[PDB]
Amino acid sequence: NKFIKINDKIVEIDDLTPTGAQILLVAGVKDIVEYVLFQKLKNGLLEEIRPEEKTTLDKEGVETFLMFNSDRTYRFTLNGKMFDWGAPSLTGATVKSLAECDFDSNDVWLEMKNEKDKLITDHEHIDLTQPNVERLYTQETSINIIVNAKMRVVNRRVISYWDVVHLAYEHAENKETSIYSVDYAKGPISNPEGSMVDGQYVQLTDGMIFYVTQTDK
Amino acid sequence: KNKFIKINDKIVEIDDLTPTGAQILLVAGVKDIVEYVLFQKLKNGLLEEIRPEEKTTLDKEGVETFLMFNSDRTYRFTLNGKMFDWGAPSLTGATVKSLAECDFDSNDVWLEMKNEKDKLITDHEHIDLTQPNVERLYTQETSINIIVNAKMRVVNRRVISYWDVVHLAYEHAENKETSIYSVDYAKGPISNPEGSMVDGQYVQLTDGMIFYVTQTDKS
Ligand SMILES: [Ca+2]
Ligand SMILES: [Ca+2]
């Protein structure tokens, strides 16, 4: 009753010392040569498993693999550690998962030699086809914003309308007889100035300014 | 002690028999360890990547062989059924022969093509590994049908000499004082479609190439 996980699918296997080729076959791949297989080790590193190479699986537990349909791999580093990757890009969210950091309270950053390090938001893609080895790191989010003239430190990069309102009025979401407006400026390039209504979100940056009003409905 | 290794055909001295990949890159002169991909070329012919933290056991004698690519990516190909990683977007026919450990002169390099006939890769042509799938390469004995003095000959080399051609027509032929063997050819490949050969020259062959060999007076 043995399973492994491949790209987050559970996959049943009946060999505890399968080769890479045997794993690609169980995974439903037609042409195994066209795939690159990695085992995701307990320390968080990815080890490539060539078709002729064996891995050893415990009788209990679920080893984890990544399988890419790719004729090449790209390298990057993540908090100093070297990774190979079977796709030309990956998202900030996938980098967080590889880093094993607190997902919501960190950002992903790409080292840049000639400009400031680049913030990679969760859904943005890091282009590994750029010519050097991309150097990525996670860092705890701590963002200083002004809400109704008061300094607020926020540990999340993207927050909601009601999140903003609550930075100005502690007990405001339940106030069915109140209408709250939200304006902002000095935001980042993805939202520099504007207004927010319920259902919207905003990406924060240091020094961003918010003005929140409460009126009777 | 007096230990040497070979990195991309440069012989370099090392003072450690179990270096890490980083230490190998550092004696090779690299400033930025992360930007290179390091392979050891094993005795079984395979390229084994060495990560910066991994050690390699070297013998006190002999010169182990490493390839060191300045590359942020690796391409895969197969060669006679074995998997290769490669730190550059192309490699030549000649480099494939070297990796294959085949006899250079009696083999051709072929690229598998799923629909067309397989492609012949000459010694100086580049195989583009940036094409979308895993390139499948193999070496095979050369076999070319030529005509020498109206007899079909199968030759197992792509390049042959004046005396090879003469001796395909007449085994006894040799250098004389009174006569010489003339060689004229036609229906050759692009490098040499038609002409004459004298001692010292070579020609590239192709199927159907025709040679005419005659013993003439030295006039
Ligand atoms: Ca890159
Ligand atoms: Ca390719």
Short mmCIF file of all heavy atoms in Angstrom, two decimals, chain A residues 74-75 127-134, chain B residues 72-73, ligand 1:
data_model
loop_
_atom_site.label_atom_id
_atom_site.label_comp_id
_atom_site.label_asym_id
_atom_site.label_seq_id
_atom_site.Cartn_x
_atom_site.Cartn_y
_atom_site.Cartn_z
N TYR A 74 17.17 24.91 -15.94
CA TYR A 74 17.71 26.22 -15.63
C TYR A 74 18.10 26.24 -14.16
O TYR A 74 17.46 25.61 -13.34
CB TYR A 74 16.68 27.31 -15.92
CG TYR A 74 16.15 27.32 -17.33
CD1 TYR A 74 15.13 26.48 -17.71
CD2 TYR A 74 16.63 28.20 -18.26
CE1 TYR A 74 14.60 26.53 -18.97
CE2 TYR A 74 16.16 28.20 -19.56
CZ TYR A 74 15.11 27.38 -19.89
OH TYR A 74 14.62 27.38 -21.17
N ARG A 75 19.12 26.97 -13.82
CA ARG A 75 19.48 27.01 -12.42
C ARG A 75 19.08 28.34 -11.80
O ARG A 75 19.10 29.38 -12.45
CB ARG A 75 20.98 26.82 -12.24
CG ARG A 75 21.41 25.54 -11.57
CD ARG A 75 22.74 24.98 -12.04
NE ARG A 75 23.84 25.92 -12.04
CZ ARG A 75 24.38 26.46 -13.13
NH1 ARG A 75 23.87 26.25 -14.33
NH2 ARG A 75 25.49 27.23 -13.01
N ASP A 127 11.74 35.01 -14.77
CA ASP A 127 12.17 34.52 -16.06
C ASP A 127 13.57 33.94 -15.91
O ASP A 127 14.56 34.68 -15.90
CB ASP A 127 12.18 35.65 -17.08
CG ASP A 127 12.64 35.18 -18.48
OD1 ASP A 127 12.76 33.94 -18.77
OD2 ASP A 127 12.86 36.05 -19.32
N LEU A 128 13.68 32.61 -15.82
CA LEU A 128 15.01 31.99 -15.72
C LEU A 128 15.79 32.01 -17.03
O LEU A 128 16.97 31.63 -17.02
CB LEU A 128 14.83 30.55 -15.22
CG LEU A 128 14.15 30.35 -13.86
CD1 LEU A 128 14.10 28.85 -13.56
CD2 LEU A 128 14.87 31.10 -12.76
N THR A 129 15.14 32.32 -18.19
CA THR A 129 15.86 32.36 -19.46
C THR A 129 16.75 33.58 -19.55
O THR A 129 17.50 33.68 -20.54
CB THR A 129 14.93 32.33 -20.70
OG1 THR A 129 14.27 33.59 -20.86
CG2 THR A 129 13.88 31.18 -20.58
N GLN A 130 16.71 34.51 -18.61
CA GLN A 130 17.72 35.55 -18.56
C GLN A 130 19.08 34.89 -18.33
O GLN A 130 19.15 33.81 -17.74
CB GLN A 130 17.44 36.59 -17.49
CG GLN A 130 16.13 37.35 -17.73
CD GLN A 130 16.08 37.99 -19.08
OE1 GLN A 130 16.90 38.82 -19.39
NE2 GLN A 130 15.15 37.54 -19.92
N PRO A 131 20.17 35.53 -18.76
CA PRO A 131 21.40 34.79 -19.06
C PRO A 131 22.26 34.28 -17.90
O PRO A 131 23.15 33.44 -18.14
CB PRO A 131 22.21 35.80 -19.89
CG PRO A 131 21.69 37.10 -19.49
CD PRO A 131 20.25 36.93 -19.25
N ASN A 132 22.13 34.79 -16.71
CA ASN A 132 22.93 34.34 -15.59
C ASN A 132 22.08 33.45 -14.69
O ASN A 132 20.94 33.16 -15.00
CB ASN A 132 23.47 35.56 -14.85
CG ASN A 132 24.41 36.37 -15.74
OD1 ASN A 132 25.49 35.94 -16.08
ND2 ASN A 132 23.95 37.49 -16.15
N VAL A 133 22.64 33.00 -13.58
CA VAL A 133 21.88 32.23 -12.60
C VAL A 133 21.12 33.22 -11.71
O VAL A 133 21.72 34.06 -11.03
CB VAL A 133 22.81 31.34 -11.77
CG1 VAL A 133 22.06 30.64 -10.67
CG2 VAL A 133 23.48 30.34 -12.66
N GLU A 134 19.80 33.15 -11.75
CA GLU A 134 18.98 34.06 -10.97
C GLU A 134 19.19 33.74 -9.50
O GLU A 134 19.27 32.57 -9.12
CB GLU A 134 17.53 33.90 -11.37
CG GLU A 134 17.22 34.48 -12.71
CD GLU A 134 17.73 33.69 -13.86
OE1 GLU A 134 17.92 32.45 -13.75
OE2 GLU A 134 17.94 34.30 -14.91
N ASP B 72 24.13 29.03 -17.25
CA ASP B 72 23.04 29.06 -16.27
C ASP B 72 22.02 27.97 -16.49
O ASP B 72 20.97 27.98 -15.84
CB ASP B 72 22.37 30.42 -16.34
CG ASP B 72 21.55 30.61 -17.59
OD1 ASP B 72 21.89 30.03 -18.65
OD2 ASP B 72 20.54 31.34 -17.50
N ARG B 73 22.28 27.06 -17.42
CA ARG B 73 21.32 26.06 -17.84
C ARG B 73 22.07 24.87 -18.43
O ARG B 73 23.23 24.99 -18.81
CB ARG B 73 20.31 26.60 -18.85
CG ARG B 73 20.92 27.06 -20.18
CD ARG B 73 19.94 27.89 -20.96
NE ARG B 73 19.81 29.18 -20.32
CZ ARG B 73 19.17 30.22 -20.83
NH1 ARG B 73 18.42 30.11 -21.91
NH2 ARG B 73 19.33 31.42 -20.27
CA CA C 1 19.03 32.30 -15.98
#
